[PDB]
Amino acid sequence: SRVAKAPVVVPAGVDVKINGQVITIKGKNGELTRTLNDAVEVKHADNTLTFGPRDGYADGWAQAGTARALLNSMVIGVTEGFTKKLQLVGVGYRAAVKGNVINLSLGFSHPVDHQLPAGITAECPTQTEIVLKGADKQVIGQVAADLRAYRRPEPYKGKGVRYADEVVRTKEAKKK
Amino acid sequence: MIGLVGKKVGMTRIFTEDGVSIPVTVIEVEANRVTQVKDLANDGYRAIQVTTGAKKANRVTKPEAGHFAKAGVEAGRGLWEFRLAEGEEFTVGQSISVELFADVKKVDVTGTSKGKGFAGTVKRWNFRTQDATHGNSLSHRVPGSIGQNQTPGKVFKGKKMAGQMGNERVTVQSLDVVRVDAERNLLLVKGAVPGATGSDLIVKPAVKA
Amino acid sequence: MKVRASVKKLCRNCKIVKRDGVIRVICSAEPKHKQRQG
Amino acid sequence: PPHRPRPRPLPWFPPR
Amino acid sequence: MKTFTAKPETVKRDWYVVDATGKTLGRLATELARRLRGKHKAEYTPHVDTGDYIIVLNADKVAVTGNKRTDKVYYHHTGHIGGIKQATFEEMIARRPERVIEIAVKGMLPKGPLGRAMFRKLKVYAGNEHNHAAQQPQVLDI
RNA sequence: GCUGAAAGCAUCUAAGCACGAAACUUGCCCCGAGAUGAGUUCUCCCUGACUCCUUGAGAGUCCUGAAGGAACGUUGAAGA
RNA sequence: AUGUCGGCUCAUCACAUCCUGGGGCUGAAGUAGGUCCCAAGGGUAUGGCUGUUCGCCAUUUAAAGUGGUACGCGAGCUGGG
RNA sequence: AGACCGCCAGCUAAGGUCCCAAAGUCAUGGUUAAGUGGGAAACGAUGUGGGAAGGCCCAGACAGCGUCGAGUCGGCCUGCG
Ligand SMILES: [K+]
Ligand SMILES: [K+]
Ligand SMILES: [K+]
Ligand SMILES: [K+]
Ligand SMILES: [K+]
Ligand SMILES: [K+]
Ligand SMILES: [K+]
Ligand SMILES: [Mg+2]
Ligand SMILES: [Mg+2]
Ligand SMILES: [Mg+2]
Ligand SMILES: [Mg+2]
Ligand SMILES: [Mg+2]
Ligand SMILES: [Mg+2]
Ligand SMILES: [Mg+2]
Ligand SMILES: [Mg+2]
Ligand SMILES: [Mg+2]
Ligand SMILES: [Mg+2]
Ligand SMILES: [Mg+2]
Ligand SMILES: [Mg+2]
Ligand SMILES: [Mg+2]
Ligand SMILES: [Mg+2]
Ligand SMILES: [Mg+2]
Ligand SMILES: [Mg+2]
Ligand SMILES: [Zn+2]
């Protein structure tokens, strides 16, 4: 509702394309496309998208609020793009990007090689840092979580793949 | 990948220089001749039909003779089909030799097991015998109880009982290919395979591998 | 995870949430507080 | 406890 | 003067074709069962099959309400001890979509020889094509 | 878990998306078209005359007897 | 007249899981545990004593699960009680 | 609801009217999303409908960070889950 009320601006160099329910947002960074819920009415109007409930649906407002938030992020995706940073804490823990493959070394007896999806690119500022870049906010989120899964931060020394801005609550081993 | 049809010649051993005796079944694999090719358009699946061996012309009925004639191959002792993988291709009339197995490390071998006739539960299902003595009355090798009581008041399907044993299709999987002698039409496989000496064997590259 | 008939907020940070027809308590700070009704 | 005696035989009678 | 009775040798049976696409399974099935039995004809006779032949196309696109698509379970027993098997509506549609309509209709037809005969007049196809042009089926909207 | 509103936040869930076990469906082995919903493919065989009747998927006579099958015999690591 | 304990033979189901599989929390450093959730595919001792079931004991095992089936099973055996 | 017998007539009772299986896929207005309906308790819970008050509120509240701009907060009774 309150999210759905606020219309999202369409900056210059951003081309919308409403095709019933299917939307397509094009820009400099990349191309994104989605299919909205059938209870969402979307209008281009004056170079600013606005959302509201189609009638005959009880969940119209809720569905509009999410549709708004998604399109808002599709806009920022094709312009600025999204960025996630992952630290590797732990002795001997290293990463290495090789095209669209991240070769991890996470204290296993075998090499971890995560194949990246379509519109994601990774970097290695240092050995113990990965920087993901992409248009889709959901996909970059997934990939980051996938990498974190390999070796989640443990609560005694905080060893493992963590997000840059993640508070890892540690605790002491029981006395005696 | 396709297989070949062969004949169980018998068992022997190969001595290795490093002083190991390998027990081998000797499988004679004559040329398998393609009699028919099945395709999706006509048959709905891809396969070859092959024949092997020979047959006296007077034992070949007219329906069978016509089938061999269309292919332009000599009558063999039977027909067997092999499903084709997507890459494979064959033509009617083509011979396939045991050279097929030149690079194959392990095979599955299918045959008809020896026939034991009507077998008891001790032999057929490894049931335990009851006491030989200590008062047992006429119930030394009999199967014991075959069910519960009023619930369920029946015997369940698949209950293990006396019956025909052997004389059925059996596959032994993942046998080592010890030797492939194209010139003698021989395949040596390590270990025993189903059937009596002289029986037909189907040999295929191992599915598990 | 504590599985109980009676699930409750134990602290202020505890949040009740229904997921897939099941009441849960989630607590960022204290994993001990994690509960599922069952 | 047992609710029946162990089976026993009957005396012979002229059968027909 | 006795009440009329249809005669198997003189009864006229027509061919119809129905599109299952987006139809609610149970509400389609009742209409099929009605027509297979011949309850829509004035010559309806309970011991005679007076019904019509019906082709059902696009069985794979039949609809169900609620969470039935994932939660409706089909059970069968193989007859071997422990041999209770099950499949969700979703699994059935993937493996054998025609069975879903056939099962729904069979359960709504009389049990016995006549009901089995009636069911033989239903021809269910997963897709949009059939091979009964020779029977010249008329389109039937259900 | 990701994205994400309802609820300006938060939230794995409502829309959407991703992982996830010897369980489930397959994959392996065997049976299997009486699967009466009785399926498919290949090959082989038969190309006479006449009469009658309540006229039809009718009956009868003569000629013809195929492909193949069965019987019989010698038998089998097949078998009561 | 619906033969009764235990043994033997042959089982079959439940899951409130003994092992193996997956997971959350831990007063979880590791190893090893505790506890709860999911899971029924398969597996799940041999002996001494006693009519025993059980139990105790010896020695194993990944484990020696708990129950239902006329306290499963004598027109299948035994007949110690 | 009390069968004296016959009828290939008609009207009703309880109970019913999508198909099995006779009769509404009847009408109008609500509720439920649980296949609840079609098995059960203490107790638990921002499920959702209705009703009556109250506190705060363009002298700028509640949420997020002095800033931003309209309804919101937490109990009561009650329907269905
Ligand atoms: K057939
Ligand atoms: K048992
Ligand atoms: K199990
Ligand atoms: K009893
Ligand atoms: K008995
Ligand atoms: K006996
Ligand atoms: K129900
Ligand atoms: Mg034999
Ligand atoms: Mg023994
Ligand atoms: Mg005696
Ligand atoms: Mg004896
Ligand atoms: Mg019964
Ligand atoms: Mg009936
Ligand atoms: Mg295993
Ligand atoms: Mg359980
Ligand atoms: Mg399995
Ligand atoms: Mg008993
Ligand atoms: Mg006896
Ligand atoms: Mg008995
Ligand atoms: Mg009336
Ligand atoms: Mg009716
Ligand atoms: Mg209506
Ligand atoms: Mg219910
Ligand atoms: Zn808490």
TrEMBL record, chain A:
Mind telling me which InterPro entries this protein's record contains?
A: Ribosomal_uL6-like, Ribosomal_uL6-like_a/b-dom_sf, Ribosomal_uL6_a/b-dom, Ribosomal_uL6_bac-type, Ribosomal_uL6_CS
BP GO terms, sorted = cytoplasmic translation
* RNA-binding is among the record's keywords: yes
Could you list this entry's UniProt keywords, alphabetically sorted.
Answer: Acetylation, Ribonucleoprotein, Ribosomal protein, RNA-binding, rRNA-binding
GO molecular function term, any single one: rRNA binding
Which Pfam family, just one, is annotated for this protein?
Ribosomal_L6
Residue span(s) of domain Large ribosomal subunit protein uL6 alpha-beta: 10-81, 89-163
GO CC list = cytosolic large ribosomal subunit
In-chain residues carrying the UniProt-annotated modification N6-acetyllysine: 43
Quaternary structure per UniProt? Answer: Part of the 50S ribosomal subunit.
| HAMAP family, A to Z | Ribosomal_uL6_B
Family in the record: Belongs to the universal ribosomal protein uL6 family.
NCBIfam families with a match to the protein in the record: L6_bact (TIGR03654)
The UniProt function text for this chain reads: This protein binds to the 23S rRNA, and is important in its secondary structure. It is located near the subunit interface in the base of the L7/L12 stalk, and near the tRNA binding site of the peptidyltransferase center.
Name assigned to this protein: Large ribosomal subunit protein uL6
Automatic annotation (TrEMBL), chain B:
Which Gene Ontology CC terms are recorded?
A: cytosolic large ribosomal subunit
Q: Which sequence ranges form a coiled-coil region, renumbered to this chain?
A: none
The alphabetical list of record keywords is:
Metal-binding, Methylation, Ribonucleoprotein, Ribosomal protein, RNA-binding, rRNA-binding
List ligand-binding residues for Mg(2+) 2.
140
One GO biological process this protein is involved in is: translation
Residues given in the record as Mg(2+) 1 binding sites: 115
| Annotated Pfam families | Ribosomal_L3
Which protein family is it in?
Belongs to the universal ribosomal protein uL3 family.
Kindly give the HAMAP family that the UniProt entry links to this protein: Ribosomal_uL3_B
Query: How is this protein named in the record?
Result: Large ribosomal subunit protein uL3
Which source organism? Escherichia coli
From TrEMBL, chain C:
Among the GO biological process terms of this entry, one is:
translation
| UniProt xrefs under Pfam families | Ribosomal_L36
Superkingdom of this protein's organism: Bacteria
Q: Which InterPro entries match?
A: Ribosomal_bL36 (IPR000473), Ribosomal_bL36_sp (IPR035977)
Which residues bind Zn(2+) per the record? Answer: 11, 14, 27, 33
Q: Which cysteines are joined by disulfide bonds?
A: 11-14, 11-27
Q: Which HAMAP family match?
A: Ribosomal_bL36 (MF_00251)
- Protein family according to the UniProt entry: Belongs to the bacterial ribosomal protein bL36 family.
Question: Which PANTHER family does this one have?
Answer: 50S RIBOSOMAL PROTEIN L36, CHLOROPLASTIC, LARGE RIBOSOMAL SUBUNIT PROTEIN BL36C
Name listed for the protein in its UniProt record: Large ribosomal subunit protein bL36
Q: Which organism is it from?
A: Escherichia coli (strain UMEA 3162-1)
